[PDB]
């Protein structure tokens, strides 16, 4: 059954041990590659609770972010030493399996140490890891399975889902993607609109954009070649990246500040996942950075302080307890090198969603935080509308009740048969961090398929 060598005896920094079983180990990716997994059983009747797979995005970021900082069974306090149980953890009603993918991200690795990869290799490795998982934990094969993720996992999940659709042994019941990049074109366009309507562009810029990048009611912010149009888009990207805004939460503070000094030590922090404005001619500031020996570089999200999670996972007693080979180097939430060597292959998710919709057997939900700019809610609502599906319920808001504080609005929901779009009012890229309880209520009603 379960691999005793993977079970967690304890986790330092935690005063009281978990009441549910949790494993940490490796799943067989391609022969050289071995993905790092962290499975946490449900806190109530795990034997019969659905299995929910969680993948983070990037590309090149660890799925241990959603666990240790978003909806895992415990969260790292600011001291980076203590762990506090989360009353809003997703593991309260489901068995969640977090997978650091692809190889090289977090504690994942490969014999050949070839961190370079691509969409197809990542999808095949994820499928092989899922098969290994089901062979290592046969007792959960029957449990209802759901594939979830965030950001770049908006590509990963549906392509992998097509693979999942080819395996009758996996009890795929539905799928959910949070703030996923459905379409670079639809994302860039919705982003430009978002920026104008959120006071980020200005009327001068807006007028120039409409003049140099649009047909009458048609705007092209994806592959427009007009010179001044491209210049305006470059200015937009400058403002979004390095003017001080938090691309993950417009209305939130910036950890330590980005428009101040670039770095305080010889460690460079990169915050470009290279998934936005890819068809636009960017400036090669990467060669500007010193390439000399000993220049350590790490990939962290913009205005996000990854210190706490790193200091926890990199703590010798935690690494030991989590059965992590002492050989592997330090831990980061995102791997710079992985992102740099990543090869994007898919353009839009149209084919993937059409493949998933053709079976009409799975319940799918896409939810977006309304203050994100990396995968703004508008781009995903446009995508879903462009899917031209049968409308089952006209768009309306959904409510959530908090302790003795009346009903509150959590967002808006559009339901077509087997696929739904939903917004989370007030949440950023990491929806669980900004609206924990609302995230839990929506997740619970999704998993349980209870209509809103």
């Amino acid at each position: 059954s379960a691999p005793d060598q993977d079970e967690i005896d304890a986790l330092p920094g935690l005063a009281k041990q978990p009441s549910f079983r949790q494993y940490s180990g490796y799943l067989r990716a391609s022969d050289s590659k071995h993905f790092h997994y962290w499975f946490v059983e449900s806190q109530n009747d795990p034997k019969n609770s659905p299995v929910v797979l969680w993948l983070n995005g990037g590309p090149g970021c660890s799925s241990l972010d959603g666990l240790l900082t978003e909806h895992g069974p415990f969260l790292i306090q600011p001291d980076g030493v203590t762990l506090e149980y989360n009353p809003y953890a997703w593991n309260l009603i489901a068995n969640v399996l977090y997978i650091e993918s692809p190889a090289g991200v977090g504690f994942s690795y490969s014999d050949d140490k070839m961190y370079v990869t691509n969409d197809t290799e990542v999808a095949e490795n994820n499928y092989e890891a899922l098969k290994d998982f089901f062979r290592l934990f046969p007792e959960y094969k029957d449990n209802k399975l759901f594939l979830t993720g965030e950001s770049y996992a908006g590509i990963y999940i549906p392509t992998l889902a097509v693979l999942v659709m080819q395996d009758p042994s996996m009890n795929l019941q539905g799928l959910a993607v949070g703030n996923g990049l459905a379409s670079y074109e639809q994302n860039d366009n919705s982003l430009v609109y978002f920026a104008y309507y959120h006071g980020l562009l200005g009327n001068r810029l807006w007028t120039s954009l409409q003049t140099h990048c649009c047909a009458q009611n048609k705007c092209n912010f994806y592959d427009n070649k007009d010179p001044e149009c491209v210049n305006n888009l470059l200015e937009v990207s400058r403002i979004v990246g390095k003017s001080g805004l938090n691309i993950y939460n417009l209305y939130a503070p910036c950890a330590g500040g980005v428009p101040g000094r670039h770095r305080y030590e010889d460690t460079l922090v990169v915050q470009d996942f290279g998934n936005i404005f890819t068809r636009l001619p960017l400036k090669r500031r990467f060669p500007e950075a010193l390439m000399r020996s000993g220049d350590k570089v790490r990939l962290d999200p913009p205005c996000t302080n990854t210190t706490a999670p790193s200091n926890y996972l990199n703590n010798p007693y935690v690494r030991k307890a989590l059965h992590i080979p002492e050989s592997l180097p330090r831990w980061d939430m995102c791997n710079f090198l992985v992102n740099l060597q990543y090869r994007r292959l898919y353009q839009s998710m149209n084919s993937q969603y059409l493949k998933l919709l053709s079976s009409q057997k799975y319940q799918i939900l896409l939810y977006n935080g309304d203050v994100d700019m990396a995968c703004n809610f508008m781009g995903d609502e446009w995508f879903v509308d462009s899917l031209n599906q049968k409308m089952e319920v006209q768009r309306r808001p959904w409510l959530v009740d908090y302790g003795e504080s009346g009903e509150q609005v959590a967002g808006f929901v559009k339901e077509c048969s087997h696929i739904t779009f939903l917004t989370i009012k007030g949440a950023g890229h990491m929806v669980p961090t900004d609206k924990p309880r609302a995230a839990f209520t929506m997740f619970s009603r999704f998993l349980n398929k209870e209509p809103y």
Partner: protein, 304 residues
């Protein structure tokens, strides 16, 4: 009029029918005193002003041989609980399965040792099976006696200084907790007791289970409850075994602790608003083979 007892994390206490509550309890072992005299001690306990008792259920007292159970007359623990309820006393039940308590083999039946290498208080499959069977027998008897079902049982101990045991098995504790929740229901209030030092709570506490400590007059009270709060930031402070005296050993001089020293310490504990149980309130008797032992070997005498 519904009986709603639950821990008030906000106000660091218990709530009984919506009212703030903290208990002042004394330990009484119905088994170290003959049933003929149970009422007597319990009435004295009521007359002392205690509103709850903290008692152990010794597994070995009811199942001397596997599958043979004794529960009538002197063996009728359920009648003892009912009698306490009739006197207007609440009950804190401590069903083990290990109770220590200077009682034989910590309550565990000696026939468990028929497997020579078996391990007690661990994830040993045969141990866990036997524990489960014992719980499946004992706990349904306690279910109607739970406060929310109209009886006197308000909280339930799962272990006893588990941090002192070598195993440090959290799978074992999780298994116990799952079985207790299954047989008794989610409504029950579950707690632990350990020595008043974080090192023991390290291996004793557990999620979804309240954590408490024990300590006597030779412990920094502030430090002890700070240690508890490090594991329970919110909720009532609780000393489940505030030692009023101490056990004896043959040959070792009888332990004596001055009355008024205990009184002063008790007042100090009460002034913090905590929950305290006086271990022991009555000691009773070490019958034929019910005594325990320490290491290096030193059996406890007949007198308790």
């Amino acid at each position: 009029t519904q009986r709603t007892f639950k821990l008030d994390y906000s106000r660091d206490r218990f709530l009984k029918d919506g009212q703030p509550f903290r208990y002042i309890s004394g330990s009484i072992h119905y088994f170290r005193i003959p049933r003929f005299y149970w009422e007597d001690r319990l009435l004295k306990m009521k007359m002392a002003g205690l509103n709850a008792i903290q008692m152990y259920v010794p597994w070995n007292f009811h199942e001397p041989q596997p599958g043979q159970y004794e529960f009538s007359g002197d063996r009728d623990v359920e009648h003892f609980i009912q009698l306490a309820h009739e006197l207007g006393l609440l009950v804190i039940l401590r069903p083990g399965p290990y109770i220590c308590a200077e009682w034989d083999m910590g309550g565990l039946p000696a026939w468990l040792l028929e497997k020579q290498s078996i391990v007690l208080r661990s994830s040993d499959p045969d141990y866990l099976v036997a524990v489960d069977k014992w719980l499946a027998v004992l706990l349904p008897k306690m279910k109607p006696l739970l406060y929310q079902n109209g009886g006197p049982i308000i909280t339930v101990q799962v272990e006893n200084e588990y941090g002192s045991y070598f195993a440090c098995d959290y799978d074992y504790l999780r298994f116990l907790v799952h079985r207790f929740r299954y047989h008794l229901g989610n409504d029950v209030i579950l707690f632990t007791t350990d020595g008043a030092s974080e090192k023991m709570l390290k291996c004793g506490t557990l999620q979804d289970l309240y954590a408490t400590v024990d300590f006597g007059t030779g412990n920094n009270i502030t430090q002890a409850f700070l240690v508890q709060r490090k594991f329970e930031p919110k909720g009532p402070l609780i000393n489940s075994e505030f030692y009023t005296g101490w056990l004896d050993h043959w040959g070792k001089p009888h332990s004596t602790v001055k009355t008024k020293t205990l009184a002063t310490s008790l007042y100090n504990l009460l002034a913090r608003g905590a929950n305290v149980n006086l271990y022991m309130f009555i000691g009773g008797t070490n019958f034929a083979y019910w005594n325990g032992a320490n290491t290096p070997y030193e059996p406890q005498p007949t007198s308790y």
